[PDB]
Scaffold this active site. Structure first.
Site, PDB file in Angstrom:
ATOM      1  N   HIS A 137       0.763  -1.207  -0.049  1.00 14.48           N
ATOM      2  CA  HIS A 137      -0.045  -0.016  -0.099  1.00 14.48           C
ATOM      3  C   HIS A 137       0.809   1.281  -0.128  1.00 14.48           C
TER       4      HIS A 137
ATOM      5  N   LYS B 157     -12.481  -6.131 -14.255  1.00 12.19           N
ATOM      6  CA  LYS B 157     -11.406  -7.153 -14.827  1.00 12.19           C
ATOM      7  C   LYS B 157     -11.088  -8.388 -14.082  1.00 12.19           C
ATOM      8  N   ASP B 158     -11.129  -8.119 -12.603  1.00 14.04           N
ATOM      9  CA  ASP B 158     -10.971  -9.594 -11.964  1.00 14.04           C
ATOM     10  C   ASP B 158     -12.022 -10.657 -11.922  1.00 14.04           C
TER      11      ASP B 158
ATOM     12  N   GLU C 132       3.948 -35.250  -5.118  1.00 12.96           N
ATOM     13  CA  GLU C 132       3.127 -34.655  -6.067  1.00 12.96           C
ATOM     14  C   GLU C 132       3.895 -33.755  -7.118  1.00 12.96           C
TER      15      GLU C 132
ATOM     16  N   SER D  89       1.534  -0.506  -7.173  1.00 17.74           N
ATOM     17  CA  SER D  89       2.135  -1.616  -7.955  1.00 17.74           C
ATOM     18  C   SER D  89       2.855  -1.010  -9.103  1.00 17.74           C
TER      19      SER D  89
HETATM   20  C1  HEM Z   1      -1.121 -16.522  -0.480  1.00 19.21           C
HETATM   21  C2  HEM Z   1      -0.167 -15.736  -1.432  1.00 19.21           C
HETATM   22  C3  HEM Z   1      -0.073 -14.359  -1.826  1.00 19.21           C
HETATM   23  C4  HEM Z   1      -1.189 -13.569  -1.878  1.00 19.21           C
HETATM   24  C5  HEM Z   1      -2.493 -13.429  -1.489  1.00 19.21           C
HETATM   25  C6  HEM Z   1      -0.731 -12.458  -2.646  1.00 19.21           C
HETATM   26  C7  HEM Z   1      -1.349 -11.182  -2.967  1.00 19.21           C
HETATM   27  C8  HEM Z   1      -0.797 -10.151  -3.837  1.00 19.21           C
HETATM   28  C9  HEM Z   1      -1.570  -9.049  -4.371  1.00 19.21           C
HETATM   29  C10 HEM Z   1      -3.248  -9.170  -4.271  1.00 19.21           C
HETATM   30  C11 HEM Z   1      -0.821  -8.263  -4.985  1.00 19.21           C
HETATM   31  C12 HEM Z   1      -1.337  -7.134  -5.666  1.00 19.21           C
HETATM   32  C13 HEM Z   1      -0.699  -6.808  -7.173  1.00 19.21           C
HETATM   33  C14 HEM Z   1      -0.757  -8.005  -8.110  1.00 19.21           C
HETATM   34  O1  HEM Z   1      -1.723  -8.728  -8.097  1.00 19.21           O
HETATM   35  O2  HEM Z   1       0.603  -8.150  -8.655  1.00 19.21           O
HETATM   36  C15 HEM Z   1       0.511  -8.715  -4.875  1.00 19.21           C
HETATM   37  C16 HEM Z   1       1.819  -8.525  -5.185  1.00 19.21           C
HETATM   38  C17 HEM Z   1       2.904  -8.872  -5.118  1.00 19.21           C
HETATM   39  N1  HEM Z   1       3.404  -9.873  -4.632  1.00 19.21           N
HETATM   40 FE1  HEM Z   1       2.038 -11.400  -3.642  1.00 19.21          FE
HETATM   41  N2  HEM Z   1       0.823 -12.786  -2.942  1.00 19.21           N
HETATM   42  C18 HEM Z   1       0.954 -14.079  -2.437  1.00 19.21           C
HETATM   43  C19 HEM Z   1       2.105 -14.656  -2.513  1.00 19.21           C
HETATM   44  C20 HEM Z   1       3.290 -14.102  -3.080  1.00 19.21           C
HETATM   45  C21 HEM Z   1       4.798 -14.651  -3.351  1.00 19.21           C
HETATM   46  C22 HEM Z   1       4.836 -15.989  -3.066  1.00 19.21           C
HETATM   47  C23 HEM Z   1       5.622 -13.806  -3.537  1.00 19.21           C
HETATM   48  C24 HEM Z   1       7.169 -13.709  -3.835  1.00 19.21           C
HETATM   49  C25 HEM Z   1       7.933 -14.806  -3.710  1.00 19.21           C
HETATM   50  C26 HEM Z   1       4.791 -12.284  -3.709  1.00 19.21           C
HETATM   51  C27 HEM Z   1       5.327 -11.374  -4.230  1.00 19.21           C
HETATM   52  C28 HEM Z   1       4.681 -10.107  -4.598  1.00 19.21           C
HETATM   53  C29 HEM Z   1       5.093  -8.752  -5.218  1.00 19.21           C
HETATM   54  C30 HEM Z   1       6.643  -8.684  -5.436  1.00 19.21           C
HETATM   55  C31 HEM Z   1       4.284  -8.262  -5.623  1.00 19.21           C
HETATM   56  C32 HEM Z   1       4.294  -6.909  -6.225  1.00 19.21           C
HETATM   57  C33 HEM Z   1       4.251  -6.912  -7.842  1.00 19.21           C
HETATM   58  C34 HEM Z   1       4.211  -5.700  -8.458  1.00 19.21           C
HETATM   59  O3  HEM Z   1       3.521  -4.769  -7.759  1.00 19.21           O
HETATM   60  O4  HEM Z   1       4.288  -5.711  -9.675  1.00 19.21           O
HETATM   61  N3  HEM Z   1       3.523 -12.646  -3.318  1.00 19.21           N
HETATM   62  N4  HEM Z   1       0.515  -9.865  -4.118  1.00 19.21           N
HETATM   63  C1  LIG Z   2      -4.475  -5.753  -7.176  1.00 19.35           C
HETATM   64  O1  LIG Z   2      -4.982  -4.735  -5.980  1.00 19.35           O
HETATM   65  C2  LIG Z   2      -5.604  -5.659  -5.121  1.00 19.35           C
HETATM   66  C3  LIG Z   2      -6.736  -6.490  -5.197  1.00 19.35           C
HETATM   67  O2  LIG Z   2      -7.127  -6.712  -6.596  1.00 19.35           O
HETATM   68  C4  LIG Z   2      -7.537  -6.956  -4.551  1.00 19.35           C
HETATM   69  C5  LIG Z   2      -8.861  -8.105  -4.709  1.00 19.35           C
HETATM   70  C6  LIG Z   2      -7.151  -6.818  -3.037  1.00 19.35           C
HETATM   71  C7  LIG Z   2      -8.044  -7.487  -1.895  1.00 19.35           C
HETATM   72  C8  LIG Z   2      -7.314  -8.561  -1.053  1.00 19.35           C
HETATM   73  C9  LIG Z   2      -6.814  -9.757  -1.147  1.00 19.35           C
HETATM   74  C10 LIG Z   2      -6.683 -10.527  -2.550  1.00 19.35           C
HETATM   75  C11 LIG Z   2      -6.388 -10.605  -0.114  1.00 19.35           C
HETATM   76  C12 LIG Z   2      -7.595 -11.667   0.467  1.00 19.35           C
HETATM   77  C13 LIG Z   2      -7.731 -11.749   1.822  1.00 19.35           C
HETATM   78  C14 LIG Z   2      -7.434 -12.841   2.513  1.00 19.35           C
HETATM   79  C15 LIG Z   2      -6.709 -13.976   1.676  1.00 19.35           C
HETATM   80  C16 LIG Z   2      -7.655 -13.178   4.194  1.00 19.35           C
HETATM   81  C17 LIG Z   2      -7.406 -14.422   4.342  1.00 19.35           C
HETATM   82  C18 LIG Z   2      -8.713 -15.510   4.543  1.00 19.35           C
HETATM   83  C19 LIG Z   2      -9.366 -15.815   5.665  1.00 19.35           C
HETATM   84  C20 LIG Z   2      -9.255 -15.201   6.733  1.00 19.35           C
HETATM   85  C21 LIG Z   2     -10.997 -16.522   5.190  1.00 19.35           C
HETATM   86  C22 LIG Z   2     -11.807 -16.559   6.569  1.00 19.35           C
HETATM   87  C23 LIG Z   2     -12.751 -17.708   6.429  1.00 19.35           C
HETATM   88  C24 LIG Z   2     -13.295 -18.401   7.598  1.00 19.35           C
HETATM   89  C25 LIG Z   2     -12.948 -17.687   8.914  1.00 19.35           C
HETATM   90  C26 LIG Z   2     -14.209 -19.436   7.310  1.00 19.35           C
HETATM   91  C27 LIG Z   2     -15.476 -19.194   8.176  1.00 19.35           C
HETATM   92  C28 LIG Z   2     -16.042 -20.440   8.931  1.00 19.35           C
HETATM   93  C29 LIG Z   2     -17.164 -20.973   8.463  1.00 19.35           C
HETATM   94  C30 LIG Z   2     -18.163 -20.502   7.343  1.00 19.35           C
HETATM   95  C31 LIG Z   2     -17.661 -22.310   9.195  1.00 19.35           C
HETATM   96  C32 LIG Z   2     -19.194 -22.614   9.316  1.00 19.35           C
HETATM   97  C33 LIG Z   2     -19.755 -23.330  10.343  1.00 19.35           C
HETATM   98  C34 LIG Z   2     -21.154 -23.078  10.773  1.00 19.35           C
HETATM   99  C35 LIG Z   2     -21.667 -23.937  11.901  1.00 19.35           C
HETATM  100  C36 LIG Z   2     -22.196 -22.777   9.721  1.00 19.35           C
HETATM  101  C37 LIG Z   2      -6.295  -6.078  -2.807  1.00 19.35           C
HETATM  102  O3  LIG Z   2      -5.915  -5.772  -1.552  1.00 19.35           O
HETATM  103  C38 LIG Z   2      -5.279  -5.201  -3.753  1.00 19.35           C
HETATM  104  O4  LIG Z   2      -4.347  -4.440  -3.667  1.00 19.35           O
HETATM  105  C39 LIG Z   2      -4.620  -3.135  -3.221  1.00 19.35           C
HETATM  106  C1  LIG Z   3       9.314 -37.704  -0.860  1.00 19.90           C
HETATM  107  C2  LIG Z   3       7.813 -37.705  -0.917  1.00 19.90           C
HETATM  108  C3  LIG Z   3       7.278 -38.716  -1.217  1.00 19.90           C
HETATM  109  C4  LIG Z   3       5.946 -39.070  -1.150  1.00 19.90           C
HETATM  110  C5  LIG Z   3       5.314 -37.945  -1.181  1.00 19.90           C
HETATM  111  C6  LIG Z   3       5.880 -36.555  -0.773  1.00 19.90           C
HETATM  112  N1  LIG Z   3       4.809 -35.640  -0.274  1.00 19.90           N
HETATM  113  N2  LIG Z   3       4.389 -35.296   1.106  1.00 19.90           N
HETATM  114  N3  LIG Z   3       3.812 -34.348   0.859  1.00 19.90           N
HETATM  115  N4  LIG Z   3       3.402 -34.103  -0.405  1.00 19.90           N
HETATM  116  C7  LIG Z   3       2.152 -33.276  -0.930  1.00 19.90           C
HETATM  117  C8  LIG Z   3       3.971 -35.071  -1.207  1.00 19.90           C
HETATM  118  O1  LIG Z   3       3.823 -35.310  -2.209  1.00 19.90           O
HETATM  119  C9  LIG Z   3       7.240 -36.659  -0.534  1.00 19.90           C
HETATM  120  C10 LIG Z   3       7.816 -35.103   0.213  1.00 19.90           C
HETATM  121  O2  LIG Z   3       8.367 -34.514  -1.145  1.00 19.90           O
HETATM  122  C11 LIG Z   3       8.870 -33.501  -0.613  1.00 19.90           C
HETATM  123  C12 LIG Z   3       9.990 -32.714  -1.357  1.00 19.90           C
HETATM  124  C13 LIG Z   3      10.374 -31.622  -0.560  1.00 19.90           C
HETATM  125  N5  LIG Z   3       9.319 -31.721   0.582  1.00 19.90           N
HETATM  126  C14 LIG Z   3       9.794 -30.728   1.612  1.00 19.90           C
HETATM  127  C15 LIG Z   3      10.190 -29.568   1.673  1.00 19.90           C
HETATM  128  C16 LIG Z   3      10.327 -28.851   2.558  1.00 19.90           C
HETATM  129  C17 LIG Z   3       9.372 -29.061   3.774  1.00 19.90           C
HETATM  130 CL1  LIG Z   3       9.515 -28.122   5.038  1.00 19.90          CL
HETATM  131  C18 LIG Z   3       8.632 -30.224   3.488  1.00 19.90           C
HETATM  132  C19 LIG Z   3       8.888 -31.026   2.571  1.00 19.90           C
HETATM  133  N6  LIG Z   3       8.781 -32.774   0.277  1.00 19.90           N
END
Ligand code: HEM
Ligand SMILES: COc1c(O)c(C)c(C/C=C(\C)CC/C=C(\C)CC/C=C(\C)CC/C=C(\C)CC/C=C(\C)CCC=C(C)C)c(O)c1OC
Ligand SMILES: Cc1cccc(-n2nnn(C)c2=O)c1COc1ccn(-c2ccc(Cl)cc2)n1
Ligand SMILES: CCCCCCCCCCC(=O)OC[C@H](COP(=O)(O)OC[C@H](O)COP(=O)(O)OC[C@@H](COC(=O)CC)OC(=O)CCC)OC(=O)CCCCCCCC
Ligand SMILES: CCCCCCCCCCCCCCCCCC(=O)OC[C@H](COP(=O)(O)OCCN)OC(=O)CCCCCCCCCCCCC
Ligand code: HEM
Ligand code: HEM
Ligand SMILES: CCCCCCCCCCCCCCCCCC(=O)O[C@H](COC(=O)CCCCCC)COP(=O)(O)OCCN
Ligand SMILES: CCCCCCCCCCCCCCCCCC(=O)O[C@H](COC(=O)CCCCCC)COP(=O)(O)OCCN
Lengths: 385, 93, 248, 74, 54
Positions: A202, A228-229, A272, A206
């Site tokens: 923030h 677009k999303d 996997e 970007s």
């Molecule tokens: C659950 C995992 C992640 C979530 C929800 C997430 C979410 C986001 C979002 C929403 C953006 C906004 C702009 C865009 O879409 O490019 C972003 C940008 C970015 N993310 Fe992630 N991200 C994740 C994992 C990662 C990982 C694994 C990396 C790198 C190793 C990473 C690095 C970056 C960088 C460098 C940007 C900026 C790119 C730019 O502004 O050009 N993020 N991320």
């Molecule tokens: C490019 O620009 C963007 C952009 O495009 C977007 C989308 C976002 C929006 C945000 C995200 C993409 C991040 C998304 C947020 C998360 C991943 C938060 C983590 C998710 C959770 C905490 C999920 C919570 C779910 C639960 C707690 C489960 C609920 C439990 C249930 C339903 C059990 C039900 C039980 C009974 C008995 C009914 C940006 O912030 C942003 O940057 C400005």
């Molecule tokens: C050897 C073998 C055989 C069969 C199944 C699986 N496996 N286990 N889980 N899943 C989805 C699988 O396919 C594996 C594990 O393979 C690997 C390779 C690197 N990691 C690893 C790296 C860092 C950390 Cl912190 C934890 C694990 N594990």
């Protein structure tokens, strides 16, 4: 002012997804971060509803997954969405990280944003390992045996870490009961690191595919990038539904439908598809302690990348030699996954050793050398002396 | 609250670029335009122009790694057949 | 490895449940249970399948009640605390031939025949592997192969040496509907019945997938149209530059 | 009524590629038959079988028979 | 115009969106189930049951 700007809770929504200034020229590669937030919601919701029917004992774990598939109403939908949704979570994350490599998103002032994303990637690999062992199939038992025995090579504390990780003398009942409790918790730590990821985004915004400043031409988030999303959200759900309903067992192994047995060894032990390139790096080092260090250094080498890029221009859009060597790194990563699914045989042993060298030489040798050459070619192609 | 460190982006009104003078822009409402007039020429002519500019940076690395995998796969098939039995004993020592 | 250590590759037959709009043939599931009871059940258990799941798939409610009442199950103990027995009901599971796995190996020369409830999903090849195994026993092994005593040759098994002999022969089962019971006919019917035992949701899953794909591909085409409408003002924007006078 | 798979395997064994692959397997089997009668068959670690020539004939028979077997089964 | 007969210039209101979504679900479920069982006629249990009794 408007109520969405003055309320304490609505101002956070307004400043992130409504009035956020975006660069005008970003393409569909900038839509992968929005898909990753949808993937994390699907995994948490489908996993909580499956956890109401699951038993984590060593003699009840395999049969309770079969109970979900047969007795629970729409229980086969819950499992297939969960098992195939984990492969879709890793495919979008690989495309999200490769977008940052191509466009120079790791560079300053976005170094803290890159470092938090590396922590998210390590916690996601650990989560998928812990949940795969909770099925207790034949692939689950021998995959947990291979990984946990790697920590017995650490000097003077090898045999104490592995016995504390087992709760006993092998992979047993205490190992599976503690792997399920840790599997419930780490997705909530990932959700807290995603919030810290968005706070660092923030303050600077970007980047754009030209690599230059975007402060001259901005458009707001609402009604351009909200709609677009929606295009990539509906395409994501359509490809995922074709795997869940029409081919639900393509991305798995058939040996995981055999109950786990500590006295029978399978013919092939393979992970996997998304863990296969890191499994081939581990098997290429003949020493046992040096293999564990090298497999974890394949993730931590992404942190040295802000320092080895010596270019004055951000991104690969106008660079000829940087574009050629980017796709060498991409197809080397696919060959490492194919080698990790083969047997230890000639010539696959030498092919996996050369490909492990090319993985590390990209970050440490190739990128600083060709960045310097491109700086001088831009200079002498314009200056007349 | 207190202020924080300096940034390179601002907000609406103080975004932080250079001063602008002399540029004028024009637009037309989307309700006054004919719908989807780029479904034919953009899909055939323009996408072909974007494809062939960037296809040698991708297909020359792709052909190197596919030729390498295909010869290693064909040599492993020879080593475990009947005709490749005395070569298997000497590359395993 | 060697091709003998991998096993022969199973070909692709034209099963009538292959395809995105196809169900099981329920007359072949009914014929395949009869080959299970009279041939397979001497040495194989089917432990994941309850009696009640057969009603409305291959038999009626009155037929399954008579099939379950031919086996004996453990009851709650007596008032004195002595054990008791009872016939079967619809909520019971189909019983196996052996009390434990020590008794199973003793009747099969040390080998253990597996449970067949998930055998279609647990082998690489699927239905094509099970059909090729049962019909692929040669009359003699090829020249040079030395089999241990008590093993048979089958080229589809990894290693080529299996502890199961050939079981299927012509006209060993008299079918109810009048189908000729050859070797290939009986091998096709067990494989259809065993695929239902592994995937009993198969007919319902392919019908809910038809509703989901139609709705999600209509939402995908409507969102491309809406995005191109809302972006039309940005895409045709024009800019003109007149350089300012050097007063400044 | 006899087995439909045994009739189709018999039919395709008498075509031109079928007679060629059968003849290759039989000349393998005789050279293994004229050894094992020589003194020296106690232990050699280089004893030859004809699995590979048997796999070649079975792969041709499966490609010809599998697209047309289930039309003859009820 | 055919759109002018029902709405005349406006967008569809949120009450008509929710009311027409429930009408859609019963018509769509019946048309899909009817096409699916006609495509697989002779293989279902209700066709086999009518031959062991007739
Ligand atoms: C659950 C995992 C992640 C979530 C929800 C997430 C979410 C986001 C979002 C929403 C953006 C906004 C702009 C865009 O879409 O490019 C972003 C940008 C970015 N993310 Fe992630 N991200 C994740 C994992 C990662 C990982 C694994 C990396 C790198 C190793 C990473 C690095 C970056 C960088 C460098 C940007 C900026 C790119 C730019 O502004 O050009 N993020 N991320
Ligand atoms: C490019 O620009 C963007 C952009 O495009 C977007 C989308 C976002 C929006 C945000 C995200 C993409 C991040 C998304 C947020 C998360 C991943 C938060 C983590 C998710 C959770 C905490 C999920 C919570 C779910 C639960 C707690 C489960 C609920 C439990 C249930 C339903 C059990 C039900 C039980 C009974 C008995 C009914 C940006 O912030 C942003 O940057 C400005
Ligand atoms: C050897 C073998 C055989 C069969 C199944 C699986 N496996 N286990 N889980 N899943 C989805 C699988 O396919 C594996 C594990 O393979 C690997 C390779 C690197 N990691 C690893 C790296 C860092 C950390 Cl912190 C934890 C694990 N594990
Ligand atoms: C396990 C399976 C997981 C699958 C998850 C899929 C989830 C969605 C993934 C979407 C994606 O990958 O996008 C990233 C990238 C986009 O590259 P680009 O060239 O399209 O952008 C340019 C411009 O913005 C288009 O601009 P355009 O003019 O094409 O926009 C209009 C377009 C919008 O349609 C879309 O949906 C675009 C995604 O309208 C049409 O196309 C009409 C179609 C009838 O896509 C590509 O470059 C294509 C190659 C991807 C390589 C992936 C390799 C791993 C499989
Ligand atoms: C821990 C280590 C993590 C390492 C992660 C590495 C994993 C990589 C896995 C594959 C991810 C996809 C690789 C390609 C990602 C492309 C990123 C990108 O932004 O590409 C930019 C480029 C756009 O090019 P320009 O911006 O210059 O304009 C031309 C547009 N027509 O766009 C393009 O030119 C795209 C051209 C097509 C790309 C082909 C890639 C094929 C990959 C197939 C892999 C699947 C094999 C089974
Ligand atoms: C980032 C989020 C998650 C990821 C990547 C993930 C990953 C996985 C994977 C790969 C499996 C093995 C699937 C299989 O092959 O059958 C699995 C199993 C399982 N997971 Fe998750 N999981 C996540 C979140 C959760 C959460 C939050 C819960 C519980 C509240 C959960 C509950 C389960 C359960 C009960 C299983 C049991 C086996 C099964 O039902 O398939 N998951 N998980
Ligand atoms: C139509 C009847 C039968 C069918 C469909 C059937 C099915 C199978 C299957 C699918 C396997 C596993 C093959 C593999 O693991 O690759 C197997 C193995 C076995 N079966 Fe059967 N079976 C039948 C009848 C019998 C009978 C009648 C006996 C014994 C008298 C028997 C004894 C065994 C044994 C001992 C094994 C283990 C073989 C080994 O592991 O080497 N089966 N059977
Ligand atoms: C770690 C994650 C937590 C961070 C998340 C922060 C963002 C949360 C998103 C919440 C979405 C918006 C919630 C509704 C906002 C309306 C609240 C409101 O009108 O403020 C209150 C109403 O009071 C309440 O009832 C509290 C609602 C609790 C909400 C429980 C979820 C009245 O508004 P107020 O008069 O304070 O406006 C000030 C304008 N100067
Ligand atoms: C629900 C979530 C609620 C979120 C609450 C947020 C507050 C919790 C965090 C508490 C502070 C603990 C971390 C502060 C450590 C200092 C970080 C730092 O120095 O920033 C970075 C270096 O650290 C990193 O690269 C990422 C570290 C990730 C930390 C993961 C826990 C330096 O940033 P810098 O101030 O230097 O800006 C550049 C100006 N040249």
């Amino acid at each position: 002012m408007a109520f969405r700007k003055s309320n304490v809770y609505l101002s956070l929504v307004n400043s992130y997804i409504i009035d956020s200034p975006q660069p005008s020229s970003i393409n569909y590669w900038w839509n992968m971060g929005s898909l990753l937030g949808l993937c994390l919601v699907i995994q948490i919701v489908t996993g909580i509803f499956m956890a109401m029917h699951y038993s984590s004992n060593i003699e009840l774990a395999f049969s309770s997954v079969e109970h979900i598939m047969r007795d629970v109403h729409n229980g086969y939908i819950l499992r297939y969405l969960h098992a195939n949704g984990a492969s879709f979570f890793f495919m979008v994350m690989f495309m999200h990280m490769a977008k940052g490599l191509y466009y120079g998103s790791y560079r300053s002032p976005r170094v803290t944003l890159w470092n938090v994303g590396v922590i998210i990637f390590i916690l996601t690999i650990a989560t998928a390992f812990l949940g795969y062992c909770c099925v207790y199939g034949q692939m689950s038992h021998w995959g947990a045996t291979v990984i946990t025995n790697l920590f017995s090579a650490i000097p003077f504390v090898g045999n104490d870490i592995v016995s504390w990780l087992w709760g006993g003398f092998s992979v047993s009942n205490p190992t599976i009961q503690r792997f399920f409790a840790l599997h419930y918790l780490v997705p909530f730590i990932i959700a807290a690191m995603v919030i810290m990821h968005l706070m660092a985004l923030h303050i600077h915004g970007s980047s754009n595919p030209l690599g230059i400043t975007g402060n001259l031409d901005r458009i707001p988030m609402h009604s351009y990038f909200i709609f677009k999303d929606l295009v990539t959200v509906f395409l994501f759900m359509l490809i995922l539904a074709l795997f869940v309903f029409y081919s639900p067992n393509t991305l798995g192994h058939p040996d995981n439908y055999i109950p786990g047995n500590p006295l029978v060894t399978p013919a092939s032990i393979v992970p996997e598809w998304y863990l296969l390139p890191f499994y081939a790096i581990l098997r290429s080092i003949p020493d046992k302690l040096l293999g564990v260090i090298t497999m974890f250094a394949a993730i931590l080498v992404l942190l040295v990348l802000p320092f080895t890029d010596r270019s004055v221009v951000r991104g690969n859009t106008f660079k000829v030699l940087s574009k050629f060597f980017f796709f060498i790194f991409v197809f080397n990563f696919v060959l490492l996954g194919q080698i990790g699914a083969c047997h230890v045989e000639v010539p696959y042993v030498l092919m996996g050793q050369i490909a492990t060298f090319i993985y590390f030489a990209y970050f440490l040798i190739i990128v600083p050398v060709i960045s310097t050459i491109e700086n001088v070619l831009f200079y002498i192609g314009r200056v007349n002396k | 609250g207190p202020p924080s460190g300096k940034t390179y982006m601002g907000w609406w009104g103080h975004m932080g670029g250079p001063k602008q003078k002399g540029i004028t822009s024009y637009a037309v409402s989307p309700y006054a335009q004919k719908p989807l007039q780029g479904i034919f020429h953009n899909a055939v002519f323009n996408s072909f122009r974007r494809f062939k500019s960037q296809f040698l940076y991708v297909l020359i690395p792709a052909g190197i790694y596919w030729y390498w995998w295909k010869n290693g796969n064909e040599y492993n098939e020879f080593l475990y057949s009947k005709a490749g039995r005395e070569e298997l004993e000497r590359v395993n020592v | 490895m060697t091709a003998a250590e991998h096993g022969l590759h199973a070909p692709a037959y034209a099963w009538s449940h292959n395809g995105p709009f196809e169900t099981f043939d329920h007359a072949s599931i009914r014929r395949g249970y009869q080959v299970y009871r009279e041939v397979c059940a001497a040495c194989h258990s089917l432990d994941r399948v309850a009696w009640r799941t057969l009603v409305g798939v291959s038999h009626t409610n009155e037929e399954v009640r008579n099939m379950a009442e031919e086996f004996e199950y453990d009851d709650e103990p007596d008032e004195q605390g002595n054990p008791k027995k009872r016939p079967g009901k619809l909520s019971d599971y189909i019983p196996g031939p052996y009390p434990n796995e020590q008794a199973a190996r003793a009747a099969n020369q040390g080998a253990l025949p597996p449970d067949l409830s998930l055998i279609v999903k647990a082998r690489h090849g699927g239905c094509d592997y099970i059909f090729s195994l049962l019909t692929g026993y040669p009359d003699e092994p090829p020249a040079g192969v030395a089999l241990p005593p008590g093993s048979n040759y089958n080229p589809y098994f990894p290693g080529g040496s299996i502890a199961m002999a050939r079981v299927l022969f012509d006209d060993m089962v008299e079918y109810e509907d009048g189908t000729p019971a050859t070797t290939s006919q009986m091998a096709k019917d067990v494989t259809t019945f065993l695929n239902w035992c592994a995937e009993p949701e198969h007919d319902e899953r392919k019908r809910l997938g038809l509703k989901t794909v139609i709705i999600l591909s209509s939402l995908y085409l409507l969102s491309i149209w809406v995005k191109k409408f809302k972006w039309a003002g940005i895409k045709t924007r024009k800019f003109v530059f007149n350089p300012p006078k050097p007063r400044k | 009524v006899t087995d439909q798979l045994e009739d189709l395997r018999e039919h395709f064994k008498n075509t031109e590629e079928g007679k060629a692959l059968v003849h290759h397997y039989e000349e393998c089997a005789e050279r293994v038959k004229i050894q094992q009668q020589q003194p020296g068959y106690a232990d050699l670690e280089h004893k030859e079988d004809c699995v590979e020539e048997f796999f070649h004939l079975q792969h041709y028979l499966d490609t010809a028979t599998a697209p047309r077997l289930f039309d003859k089964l009820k | 115009s055919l759109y002018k007969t029902f709405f005349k210039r406006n967008a569809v209101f949120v009450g008509t969106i929710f009311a027409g979504a429930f009408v859609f679900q019963t018509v769509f479920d019946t048309a899909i189930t009817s096409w699916y069982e006609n495509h697989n006629k002779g293989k279902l249990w209700k066709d086999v049951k009518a031959r062991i009794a007739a």
